[PDB]
Ligand binder design. Structure first.
Ligand SMILES: C#C[C@]1(O)CC[C@H]2[C@@H]3CCC4=CC(=O)CC[C@@H]4[C@H]3CC[C@@]21CC
Length: 247
């Protein structure tokens, strides 16, 4: 309608809701395994999605692969925030329609602590009242929010691609926002993205530790998920990548 074309395209390429396949007898092991399964399924959707994402397929194949493997985590927790904020007013973590967790289902300490950290996103969503339009644009920026220390092969086309999406976000902010109020809401939304780097870092550490101890904890990791983890997680944890900040 009165909504910009690219934002409309972004909405059309958003995947259908993904189920985890959970049963429900939730042990910590059966819960983590279900979360890795849902992740495996989300990874597939991310990749298929990036192929319709305007501008993405025009970057080097190496670059497409690097950006995906660098951002899967941030993307999955950011979309967790949306679903949570949208279906249960952000007061419950809506991983999937068959895997929604309240405070009672988070028995183990470390696990409840991880959840409390992810919960910050849907809480900001409820607070700033993030829009469907703003969300879609921000999700794309996250895909383009970290690059190799030495840069990307198609760096120029990447920088041009990222600017279009920053301009697109401003368009979505202009849908509801004034000059100072719009300029202020821009500061707010790009600061939120900035704060995700630090947020995703804790999820990474918890993930790699759970992966490395997958035998003991009896927690299974699928093939595609095991690959991105093994291929990029350690490097990222060691801070051997370049985070793109707005502030
Ligand atoms: C529990 C656990 C973890 O190990 C640490 C952070 C976690 C992820 C955080 C975000 C996420 C949102 C979803 O909607 C699908 C499952 C995924 C998660 C699966 C399990 C992880 C990554 C493998």
């Amino acid at each position: 309608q009165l909504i910009p074309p690219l934002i409309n395209l972004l909405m059309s390429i958003e995947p259908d809701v993904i189920y985890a396949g959970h049963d429900n007898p939730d042990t910590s092991s059966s819960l983590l395994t279900s979360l890795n399964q849902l992740g495996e399924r989300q990874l597939l959707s991310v990749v298929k999605w990036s192929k319709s994402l305007p501008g993405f397929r025009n970057l080097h194949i190496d670059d497409q692969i690097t950006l995906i493997q660098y951002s899967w985590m941030s993307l999955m927790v950011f979309g967790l925030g949306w679903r949570s904020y949208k279906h249960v007013s952000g007061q419950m973590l809506y991983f999937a329609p068959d895997l929604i967790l309240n405070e009672q289902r988070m028995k183990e300490s470390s696990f409840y602590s991880l959840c409390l950290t992810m919960w910050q996103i849907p809480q900001e969503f409820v607070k700033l009242q993030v829009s469907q339009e703003e969300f879609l644009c921000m999700k794309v920026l996250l895909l383009l929010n970290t690059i190799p220390l030495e840069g990307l092969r198609s760096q120029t086309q990447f920088e041009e691609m990222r600017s279009s999406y920053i301009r697109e976000l401003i368009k979505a902010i202009g849908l509801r926002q004034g000059v100072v109020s719009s300029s202020q809401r821009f500061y707010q939304l790009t600061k939120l993205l900035d704060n995700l780097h630090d947020l995703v870092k804790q999820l990474h550490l918890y993930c790699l530790n759970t992966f490395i101890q997958s035998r003991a904890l009896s927690v299974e990791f699928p093939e595609m998920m095991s690959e991105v983890i093994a291929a990029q997680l350690p490097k990222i944890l060691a801070g051997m990548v370049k985070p793109l900040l707005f502030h």
